[PDB]
Amino acid sequence: MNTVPFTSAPIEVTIGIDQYSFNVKENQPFHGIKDIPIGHVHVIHFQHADNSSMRYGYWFDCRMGNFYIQYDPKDGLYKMMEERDGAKFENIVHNFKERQMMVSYPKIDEDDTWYNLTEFVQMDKIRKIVRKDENQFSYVDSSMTTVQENELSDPAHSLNYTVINFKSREAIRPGHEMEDFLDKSYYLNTVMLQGIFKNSSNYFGELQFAFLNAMFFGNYGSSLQWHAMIELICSSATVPKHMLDKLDEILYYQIKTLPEQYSDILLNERVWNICLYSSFQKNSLHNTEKIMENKYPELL
Amino acid sequence: GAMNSSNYAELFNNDIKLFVDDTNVYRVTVHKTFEGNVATKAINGCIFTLNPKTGHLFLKIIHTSVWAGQKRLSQLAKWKTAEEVSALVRSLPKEEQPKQIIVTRKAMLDPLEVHMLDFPNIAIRPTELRLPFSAAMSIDKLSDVVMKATEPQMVLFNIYDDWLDRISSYTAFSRLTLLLRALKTNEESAKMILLSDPTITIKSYHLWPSFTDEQWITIESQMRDLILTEYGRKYNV
Numbered sequence: 001m002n003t004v005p006f007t008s009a010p011i012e013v014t015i016g017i018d019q020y021s022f023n024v025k026e027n028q029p030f031h032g033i034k035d036i037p038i039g040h041v042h043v044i045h046f047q048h049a050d051n052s053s054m055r056y057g058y059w060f061d062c063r064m065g066n067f068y069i070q071y072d073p074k075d076g077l078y079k080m081m082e083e084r085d086g087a088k089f090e091n092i093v094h095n096f097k098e099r100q101m102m103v104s105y106p107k108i109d110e111d112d113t114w115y116n117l118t119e120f121v122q123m124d125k126i127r128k129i130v131r132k133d134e135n136q137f138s139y140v141d142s143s144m145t146t147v148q149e150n151e152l153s154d155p156a157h158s159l160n161y162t163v164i165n166f167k168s169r170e171a172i173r174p175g176h177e178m179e180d181f182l183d184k185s186y187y188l189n190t191v192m193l194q195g196i197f198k199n200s201s202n203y204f205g206e207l208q209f210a211f212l213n214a215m216f217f218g219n220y221g222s223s224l225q226w227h228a229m230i231e232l233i234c235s236s237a238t239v240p241k242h243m244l245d246k247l248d249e250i251l252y253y254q255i256k257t258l259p260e261q262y263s264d265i266l267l268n269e270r271v272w273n274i275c276l277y278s279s280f281q282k283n284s285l286h287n288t289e290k291i292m293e294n295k296y297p298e299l300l
Numbered sequence: 301g302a303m304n305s306s307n308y309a310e311l312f313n314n315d316i317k318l319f320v321d322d323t324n325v326y327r328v329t330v331h332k333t334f335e336g337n338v339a340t341k342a343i344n345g346c347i348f349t350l351n352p353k354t355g356h357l358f359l360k361i362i363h364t365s366v367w368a369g370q371k372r373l374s375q376l377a378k379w380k381t382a383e384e385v386s387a388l389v390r391s392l393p394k395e396e397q398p399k400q401i402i403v404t405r406k407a408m409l410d411p412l413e414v415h416m417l418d419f420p421n422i423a424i425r426p427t428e429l430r431l432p433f434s435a436a437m438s439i440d441k442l443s444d445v446v447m448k449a450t451e452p453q454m455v456l457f458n459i460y461d462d463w464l465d466r467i468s469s470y471t472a473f474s475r476l477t478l479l480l481r482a483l484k485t486n487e488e489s490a491k492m493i494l495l496s497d498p499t500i501t502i503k504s505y506h507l508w509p510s511f512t513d514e515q516w517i518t519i520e521s522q523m524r525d526l527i528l529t530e531y532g533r534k535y536n537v
């Protein structure tokens with residue numbers, strides 16, 4: 001069980017840790033989050049009480065280092081930092097725990113939600129989407145644009161998701177125009193899976209990361225990428241059976257976790273109706289179709 | 301974006317452009333089978349590809365053999381259209397290639413865009429104009445070459461005959477669209493108007509009769525009356 005200590009909490013902020021969140025008051029004696037499960041990536045995220053603009057946060061894996069949070073009054077945000085002095089860190093944490101100044105990662109034993117949302121998400125792949133090689137953790141916020149968005153502007157602050165474009169030479173074989181546009185299997189299986197991602201686990205990892213950035217930061221570009229990766233599978237006639245079954249589980253838990261009230265900003269009517277009711281895979285996503293129909297029947 | 305009544309003169313500027321109409325590509329007769337079911341029989345069709353500034357018509361004849369053994373023919377016909385238009389563009393010298401292609405039906409946009417990915421600088425545009433190009437098969441010489449074809453074939457025409465020697469391309473386009481609208485609303489009457497007077501003839505190298513300027517004004521007036529009539533006969537007004 002790992003710990004992310006906080007130096008202090010000088011400004012009032014809502015703090016998220018994965019799918020949980022809690023409010024900290026200005027100058028409240030808060031010194032971090034303990035009992036964080038080992039084995040998963042995690043995200044610790046922030047919304048200031050005085051400017052709900054810019055949700056921001058940090059993806060990290062406690063196996064990769066000892067990380068802590070410290071507010072910067074010049075840049076005006078809570079920053080993640082790495083402590084290289086292991087004994088300093090253990091001594092800081094042990095003292096904060098002794099004084100019970102930490103919140104406990106509040107995992108229910110029955111509850112596999114976070115595993116089910118991050119099953120294929122790896123820190124090493126996050127660090128290639130979010131490029132800042134001097135840190136082991138990755139910063140994301142509400143406003144960051146994707147490489148694809150920039151093509152249609154600071155490249156160092158971009159989300160380098162894999163570009164997917166259904167009307168592109170990459171997607172469409174010369175001489176198979178109609179075939180490749182109406183059945184995207186060659187783009188999915190040969191171009192993306194064999195060529196770019198190498199395997200379906202990496203594809204699902206990026207899909208899951210894009211969803212989580214959409215949900216936790218309201219990142220529009222991330223939302224676009226999530227839907228594009230869903231649509232590419234659903235619009236393929238030939239998809240490995242294990243991938244369709246896993247996709248159904250992935251989407252089921254994403255839809256389950258989404259706030260009931262954000263379905264108008266985080267769900268695209270066209271994509272979901274096409275995927276569940278018109279696409280090649282309209283009959284292959286039973287769990288997702290069932291939860292969508294019972295939770296968001298308006299969208300459909 | 302889309303072409304409409306507001307940017308109408310753009311059709312006659314010096315940027316090469318083509319209209320593409322696909323409404324006569326896939327053509328069928330519907331009939332009863334011996335068992336009393338219904339079946340279709342395809343007949344030859346054509347892509348109508350027109351430069352509105354010069355009158356040059358690229359008429360690609362679509363022979364019924366292209367449909368043999370194929371499914372979902374109404375969908376295939378849009379992609380076949382786009383394939384043939386792309387092939388035509390590639391066949392033209394660079395300085396003759398269009399800068400814009402305007403499709404008369406919005407369902408042609410994605411097929412044509414996908415087939416023209418190699419030409420990112422050619423704009424593919426819809427239009428809000430309701431153009432009457434479906435009536436092209438009411439022009440006798442065009443219908444004749446389509447029905448007589450035994451194989452895929454491209455035939456080149458000037459749909460304005462020699463009109464541009466005397467009138468502008470705006471006025472020629474307006475005359476063409478009036479003639480075609482009339483033929484579309486009441487083909488028999490329209491053709492009566494055009495051929496009533498046997499002393500006015502169609503030159504071998506032309507599509508329409510050799511009307512004088514004054515005769516065209518009379519013809520054009522008769523076509524407006526017909527369209528208004530039919531609009532009355534239709535709605536009872």
Ligand SMILES: COC[C@H](C)NC(=O)C1=NN(C)C(=O)CC1
Nearest residue numbers: 214217218219220221223265266
């Ligand atoms: C076109 O980009 C901006 C466009 C108005 N949408 C947004 O800014 C939002 N998008 N999403 C997905 C959110 O969760 C917050 C609001």
